[PDB]
Design an enzyme around this catalytic site. Structure first.
Site, mmCIF file in Angstrom:
data_model
loop_
_atom_site.group_PDB
_atom_site.id
_atom_site.type_symbol
_atom_site.label_atom_id
_atom_site.label_comp_id
_atom_site.label_asym_id
_atom_site.label_seq_id
_atom_site.Cartn_x
_atom_site.Cartn_y
_atom_site.Cartn_z
ATOM 1 C CG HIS A 184 91.599 -10.146 19.872
ATOM 2 N ND1 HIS A 184 90.607 -9.395 20.466
ATOM 3 C CD2 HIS A 184 92.146 -9.352 18.916
ATOM 4 C CE1 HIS A 184 90.571 -8.195 19.918
ATOM 5 N NE2 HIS A 184 91.502 -8.136 18.977
ATOM 6 C CG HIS A 186 90.664 -8.270 15.630
ATOM 7 N ND1 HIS A 186 91.360 -7.177 16.115
ATOM 8 C CD2 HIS A 186 91.405 -8.776 14.615
ATOM 9 C CE1 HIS A 186 92.442 -7.003 15.372
ATOM 10 N NE2 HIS A 186 92.496 -7.964 14.465
ATOM 11 C CG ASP A 190 95.817 1.077 22.632
ATOM 12 O OD1 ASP A 190 96.530 1.903 23.236
ATOM 13 O OD2 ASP A 190 96.287 0.108 21.990
ATOM 14 N NE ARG A 191 91.407 3.374 17.883
ATOM 15 C CZ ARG A 191 91.687 2.614 16.826
ATOM 16 N NH1 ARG A 191 91.894 1.299 16.949
ATOM 17 N NH2 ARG A 191 91.749 3.173 15.622
ATOM 18 C CG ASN A 234 94.583 -6.296 17.718
ATOM 19 O OD1 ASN A 234 93.470 -6.726 18.101
ATOM 20 N ND2 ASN A 234 94.712 -5.158 17.029
ATOM 21 C CG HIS A 235 94.506 -2.578 20.513
ATOM 22 N ND1 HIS A 235 94.612 -1.221 20.307
ATOM 23 C CD2 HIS A 235 93.972 -3.089 19.378
ATOM 24 C CE1 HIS A 235 94.149 -0.919 19.107
ATOM 25 N NE2 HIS A 235 93.751 -2.035 18.521
ATOM 26 C CG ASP A 294 91.641 -5.524 20.961
ATOM 27 O OD1 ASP A 294 92.820 -5.863 21.213
ATOM 28 O OD2 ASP A 294 91.232 -5.485 19.758
ATOM 29 C CG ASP A 320 87.695 -5.581 20.320
ATOM 30 O OD1 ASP A 320 87.691 -6.828 20.398
ATOM 31 O OD2 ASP A 320 88.432 -4.940 19.506
ATOM 32 C CG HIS A 364 89.460 -1.107 21.908
ATOM 33 N ND1 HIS A 364 90.803 -1.411 21.901
ATOM 34 C CD2 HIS A 364 88.919 -1.795 20.868
ATOM 35 C CE1 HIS A 364 91.063 -2.260 20.917
ATOM 36 N NE2 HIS A 364 89.936 -2.524 20.275
ATOM 37 N NE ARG A 391 91.945 -6.278 11.502
ATOM 38 C CZ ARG A 391 90.987 -5.869 12.346
ATOM 39 N NH1 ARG A 391 91.065 -4.700 12.961
ATOM 40 N NH2 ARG A 391 89.922 -6.619 12.575
HETATM 41 MN MN LIG Z 1 90.123 -4.147 18.931
HETATM 42 MN MN LIG Z 2 91.611 -6.310 17.999
#
Ligand SMILES: [Mn+2]
Ligand SMILES: [Mn+2]
Ligand SMILES: [Ca+2]
Ligand SMILES: [Ca+2]
Lengths: 293, 355, 582
Positions: free
Chosen positions: A166, A240, A87-88, A116-117, A84, A56, A58, A213
């Protein structure tokens, strides 16, 4: 002819390295080319050692720079990123467009996998949609990347032996051939084997169990081992989950989790890490703190 | 070079137009009226003959001193529109030269009153407001503020032809006849916006003096804004002269600027407003000292609320990432505008509505 | 002067593209010169005065250009027509352009005759000083000093009045602006006015409720000192400076420490002796670390400026005690601040006390647990280096360097690396080779690439100090051996090392003793090395002879162009073509 675009692309990379976004239609062109490459990669990407594995990021672009100061510059050192990208952070744009620029420039020197992102649905909430919007007057850039994300491979297999991923394992999948039979070219479903790959987690519990989650399963050592032995694998490498130490072994080293975004969202206080796999597939970890400003 | 570089500076302007054809159309129109004297009722027709949008009718009538007796004569009307046409070569120049005090060449808050008085008396969507009243007067003040907020980007008290040209204001004057629901013109004339703004003010000004103070303002949005930010509104950073600093009191007008800035902080005016407030020393940069002076109070409030307050140093790193300042360790007004996230920056230092 | 593109430039002044406007503004000097004085007044300035640009880069440029225009408007008689645009600029929302606007106004003032100042320039400043926005009264402040000297008595008085109002303004931003300009304004007043008028203004500003305003009084304290006869100082300045020193706000105590040297220089060695030194001690044991740190940074400069008669004794009896305390100090910025300048005191004390009193302090800071402290010592021995033997200290520096070189935080390692060449020079090649070569070698296989990278460029730095023979002797054998590392990251380093070394090592050594290695590595099983072999031949080809390029180099590249891996093919092609072997 190709050399003209090679240097056009080298400058895009120079530029991104100064944290300067490419334009809406430079981005559009980069994404058409990347699809063309990715559509040829299998859901389980054969990758050869040596190679440095990361997790990740991000959107933490300054920390990605920091990662390259630790592991060396692409293309000199080969990379495997486990998703990933987005995002963020505030520089999810600059961040992804670099890594896919690298992929397009250096097919063979970098592998990028789906997190997943890299999903339409998640990017719409955890910041990548709004960022794209702020930065380019409309939604096309986001539309160009999220179409691209569909073409990103799900898993990688380093030297027939290390399985990169991931998220984690799926009760819908027993073999790598089960994975290669899937159809990856679609948005991530809310449930199913494709979903599981990018959402599952390792557990202190036994067997399977529902993820806390909201998607995918959890899994215990017993599951890791069965799956590894079944497929002839030394280890499952995955991302992840934030781990405070940057990496974290589990299930008797059948699984390691690599997380490459230090001090996640400026709060969490973790370190980041990457795993180097040398010329004969032997592992080695490098931990790092965030870049100073 | 007298030839090769022809003259590029025009005191007035450049353009073409048939001024006599228009005097003529005005003349035939005025010939429909008793004694060739146009009454306020008749000025729709006269506005149209002048080639103007309907709602220039007020300014036009006013311009020729018609409000004096309730009617204006064709000779006097023609005399002044003629002078406009001869001297004012575009919409923005014409409008200024109609409303302006003589000599000035700029528009001041009061110059807009006869225009707006007409919008209220005439426009379908404001019928219920016709009565001379409190909501009548306050709607007029409010809209004028909104005009200045958007048009007068220099913060001088003086709206200029240039500034008018550069804004969208005259397009909204145009759209008044086409749109019978005034709420559709969200940019200056929306009633529903004014209703919110006035009710917000009214609930704080409990003595109804039309004047509000630091204590009163502190009660707005359940003290959502920080105290150090509030005392800063009364500092001279965003209001004119000596009065506010001396009396610790702002007018309704000033509260409109405050409130519109609070409502939306992405805006170039809003960013100037809040920047003025944060630059405690006025040096044009937000030093870490100035930031910490605000953040320390955010922290104590987050504490009161049992929330983990991100420590300053970790916060400063996040803020400097968010705004991408041009020169390291110096946050300037320009940097703040470029970033598109000014509002999150500002909220982070003096707002607690999340949550 | 082809007038057409000029006329285009003039047109482009009102274009939507910022960078075209920018370019035309920057060329205003050409435009005005081509259309000649007459018209630059009657068209250019008014046109220019009427434009809005919501853009810093442009407004700056404009204000800069206007400051230089006095010739291009027909000289001294006509300058007053540059005031109208510089006024509005002195009014804009952005401080940067407001500053630049007044910088320009000040340059312009010197061209106004006296009469022109009274008639035009002064009315301008009054308007600004009576302005509705603080912003505008801020700008006014910078403008008094530059017109006051050359105008009449009766006008001087008004400038004093208007300045005095600015100091008393009901808005702190303006008082801060006046405070920052008080000293400069005093420099041009007459002394009896400095006394009766400035000192009171100085006083109140010094006790203003905003520390923003108070902390600018210490700089004022300097300028007023330099303006006064030392016999008047104690009376007029010192009570205020002494207030500043034990001021409640640390930000204003910081200012006096931070400005201690200019005060000293300004205030005269007499009062320095009696008043400063004691004040200086309290700063060094201030409750707030930032203020102790600030004072620690001034130990050298301050000591080295006392009159030689009291100098040695007050250092010993009064200053060095406080230093002892500050070496043990709880704060790391404080220590390391001292560390960067502590040792520069040995010249001033002679090797006698240096060994007895200072050497124990240098040593304590070598074994401090904070690296920034050690690094500050390690990188500032040049002063004592000569006063005492560096050969004395070597036994102490080595333990410490070895710690840093192998520290667990790579930015620490990076830091000592950056200082290695200097250290190698100070201790000489004999000691370097005996003790430090093993460290530099170690770094080339450090786990972090940023460190390998720094180390490889550290080698080039060393070759320059010690020459190419030392390099072939002690460095090259170990660099080359690394080409058998089983790890590819390490094999590439060999090639990166060769890349820099060939710059300094000369054609013979490169040809005979580095090239064979590069060529052999073309058979490496990992493509990353193969393609870097191509890159490396491109980088060193220039130092080689056309014989070698033709005979040994070209075959290898040509072989790599038919290699299996896409990138080795590409970069081998590029080596051929930029080396002209295609
Ligand atoms: Mn992540
Ligand atoms: Mn993830
Ligand atoms: Ca009241
Ligand atoms: Ca400031």
């Amino acid at each position: 002819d190709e050399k003209v675009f090679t240097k056009e692309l080298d400058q895009w990379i120079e530029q991104l390295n100064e944290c300067k976004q490419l334009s809406e239609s430079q981005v559009k062109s980069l994404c058409e080319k990347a699809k063309e490459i990715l559509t040829k990669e299998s859901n389980v990407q054969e990758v050869r050692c040596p190679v440095t594995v990361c997790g990740d990021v991000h959107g933490q672009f300054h920390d990605l720079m920091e990662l390259f100061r630790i592991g060396g510059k692409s293309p000199d050192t080969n990379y495997l990123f486990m998703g990933d990208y987005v995002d963020r952070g505030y520089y999810s744009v600059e961040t992804v467009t670099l890594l896919v620029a690298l992929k397009v420039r250096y097919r063979e020197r970098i592998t990028i996998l789906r997190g997943n992102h890299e999903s339409r649905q998640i990017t719409q909430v955890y910041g990548f949609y709004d960022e794209c919007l702020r930065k380019y007057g409309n939604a096309n850039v986001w539309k160009y990347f999220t179409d691209l994300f569909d073409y990103l491979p799900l898993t990688a297999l380093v030297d027939g032996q290390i399985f990169c991923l991931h998220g984690g394992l799926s009760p819908s999948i027993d073999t790598l051939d089960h994975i290669r039979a899937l159809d990856r070219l679609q948005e991530v479903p809310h449930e199913g084997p494709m979903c599981d790959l990018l959402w599952s987690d390792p557990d202190d519990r036994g067997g399977w169990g529902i993820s806390p989650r909201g998607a995918g399963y959890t899994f215990g050592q017993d599951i890791s081992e069965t799956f590894n032995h079944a497929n002839g694998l030394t280890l499952v490498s995955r991302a992840h989950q934030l781990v405070m130490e940057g990496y974290n072994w589990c299930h008797d080293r059948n699984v390691v989790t690599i997380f490459s975004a230090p001090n996640y969202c400026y709060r969490c206080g973790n370190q980041a890490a990457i795993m180097e796999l040398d010329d004969t597939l032997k592992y080695s970890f490098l931990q790092f703190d965030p870049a100073p400003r | 070079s007298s030839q090769s570089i022809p003259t590029f500076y025009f005191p007035r302007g450049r353009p073409s137009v048939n001024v006599d054809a228009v005097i003529s159309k005005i003349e035939s129109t005025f010939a429909r009226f008793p004694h060739e004297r146009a009454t306020m009722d008749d000025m729709g027709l006269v506005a149209k003959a002048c080639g103007c949008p309907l709602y220039w009718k007020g300014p036009l009538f006013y311009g020729a001193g018609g409000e004096r007796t309730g009617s204006v004569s064709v000779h006097k009307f023609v005399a002044m529109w003629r002078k406009i046409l001869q001297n004012c070569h575009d919409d923005a120049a014409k409008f200024v030269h109609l409303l302006m005090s003589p000599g000035c060449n700029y528009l001041v808050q009061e110059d807009f009153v006869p225009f707006l008085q007409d919008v209220v008396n005439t426009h379908p969507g404001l019928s219920f407001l016709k009565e001379a009243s409190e909501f009548h007067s306050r709607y007029i003040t409010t809209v004028i503020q909104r005009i200045f907020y958007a048009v007068n980007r220099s913060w001088s008290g003086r709206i200029t032809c240039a500034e008018l040209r550069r804004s969208s204001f005259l397009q909204n004057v145009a759209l008044l006849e086409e749109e019978a629901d005034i709420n559709q013109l969200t940019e200056f004339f929306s009633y529903e916006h004014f209703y919110v703004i006035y009710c917000k003010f009214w609930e704080l000004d409990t003595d109804h003096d039309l004047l509000i103070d630091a204590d009163d303002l502190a009660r707005h949005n359940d003290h959502a804004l920080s105290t150090k930010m509030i005392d800063r509104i009364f500092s001279g950073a965003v209001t004119r002269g000596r009065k506010v600093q001396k009396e610790g009191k702002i007018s309704y007008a000033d509260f409109v600027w405050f409130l519109i800035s609070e409502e939306d902080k992405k805006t170039p005016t809003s960013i100037e407003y809040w920047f003025r407030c944060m630059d405690l020393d006025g040096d044009g940069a937000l030093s870490m000292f100035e930031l910490e002076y605000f953040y320390e109070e955010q922290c104590r409030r987050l504490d009161s609320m049992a929330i983990e307050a991100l420590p300053f140093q970790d916060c400063l790193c996040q803020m400097l990432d968010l705004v991408k300042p041009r020169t390291e360790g110096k946050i300037t007004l320009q940097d703040l505008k470029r970033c598109k996230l000014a509002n999150v920056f500002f909220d982070t230092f003096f707002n607690i509505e999340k949550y | 002067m082809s007038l057409y593109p000029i006329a285009v430039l003039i047109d482009e002044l009102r274009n939507e593209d910022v960078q075209l406007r920018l370019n035309s503004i920057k060329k205003l000097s050409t435009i005005a010169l081509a259309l000649g004085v007459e018209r630059t007044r009657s068209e250019l300035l008014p046109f220019l005065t009427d434009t809005i640009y919501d853009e810093d880069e442009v407004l700056l440029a404009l204000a800069e250009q206007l400051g230089t225009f006095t010739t291009l408007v027909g000289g001294p008689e006509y300058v007053h027509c540059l005031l109208p645009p510089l006024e509005s600029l002195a009014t804009v929302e952005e401080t940067v352009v407001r500053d630049k606007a007044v910088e320009s106004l000040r340059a312009i003032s010197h061209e106004h005759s006296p009469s022109d100042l009274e008639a035009h320039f002064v009315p301008l400043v009054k308007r600004l000083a009576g302005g509705d926005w603080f912003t505008s009264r801020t700008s006014a402040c910078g403008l008094f000093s530059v017109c006051y000297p050359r105008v009449s008595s009766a006008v001087k008085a008004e400038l004093r009045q208007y300045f005095r109002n600015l100091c008393s303004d009901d808005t702190p931003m303006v008082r801060r602006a006046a405070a920052s300009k008080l000293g400069e304004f005093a420099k041009v007043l007459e002394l009896d006015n400095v006394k009766s008028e400035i000192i009171p203004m100085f006083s109140n500003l010094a006790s203003d409720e905003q520390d923003s305003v108070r902390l600018l009084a210490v700089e004022a304290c300097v300028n007023i000192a330099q303006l006064l006869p030392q016999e008047d100082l104690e009376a007029l300045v010192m009570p205020t400076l002494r207030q500043a020193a034990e001021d409640k706000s640390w930000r204003v105590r910081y200012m006096v420490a931070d400005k201690f040297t200019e005060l000293q220089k300004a205030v005269g060695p007499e009062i320095t002796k009696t008043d400063l030194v004691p004040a200086f001690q309290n700063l060094m044991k201030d409750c707030e670390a930032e203020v102790r740190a600030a004072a620690s940074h001034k130990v050298k400069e301050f000591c080295e400026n006392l009159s030689a008669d009291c100098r040695e004794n007050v250092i010993m009896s009064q200053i060095l005690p406080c230093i002892k305390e500050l070496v043990s100090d709880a704060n790391q910025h404080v220590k390391s601040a001292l560390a960067s300048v502590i040792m520069g005191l040995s010249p001033i004390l002679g090797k006698d006390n240096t060994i007895e009193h200072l050497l124990p302090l240098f040593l304590a800071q070598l074994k401090d647990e904070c690296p920034e402290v050690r690094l500050n010592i390690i990188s500032n021995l040049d002063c004592v280096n000569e006063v005492i033997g560096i050969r004395q200290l070597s036994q102490s520096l080595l333990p410490a360097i070895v710690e840093l070189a192998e520290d667990a935080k790579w930015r620490v390692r990076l830091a000592i690396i950056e200082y290695m060449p200097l250290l190698a020079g100070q201790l000489g090649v004999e000691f370097f080779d005996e003790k430090l070569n093993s460290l530099c070698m170690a770094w080339l296989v450090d786990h972090v690439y940023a460190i390998r990278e720094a180390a490889t460029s550290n080698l080039k730095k060393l070759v320059e100090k010690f020459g190419k023979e030392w390099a072939h002797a002690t460095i090259i054998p170990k660099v080359l051996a690394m080409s058998g590392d089983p790890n590819y990251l390490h094999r590439m380093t060999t090639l990166f090392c060769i890349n820099v070394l060939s710059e300094v090592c000369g054609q013979d050594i490169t040809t005979k003793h580095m090239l064979p290695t590069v060529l052999r590595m073309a058979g490496d099983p990992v493509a990353n090395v193969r393609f870097n072999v191509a890159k490396s031949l491109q980088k060193i080809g220039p130092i080689l002879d056309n014989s070698t390029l033709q005979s040994e180099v070209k075959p290898i590249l040509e072989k790599l162009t038919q290699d299996q891996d896409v990138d080795v093919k590409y970069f081998a092609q590029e080596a051929l073509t930029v080396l002209s072997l295609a």
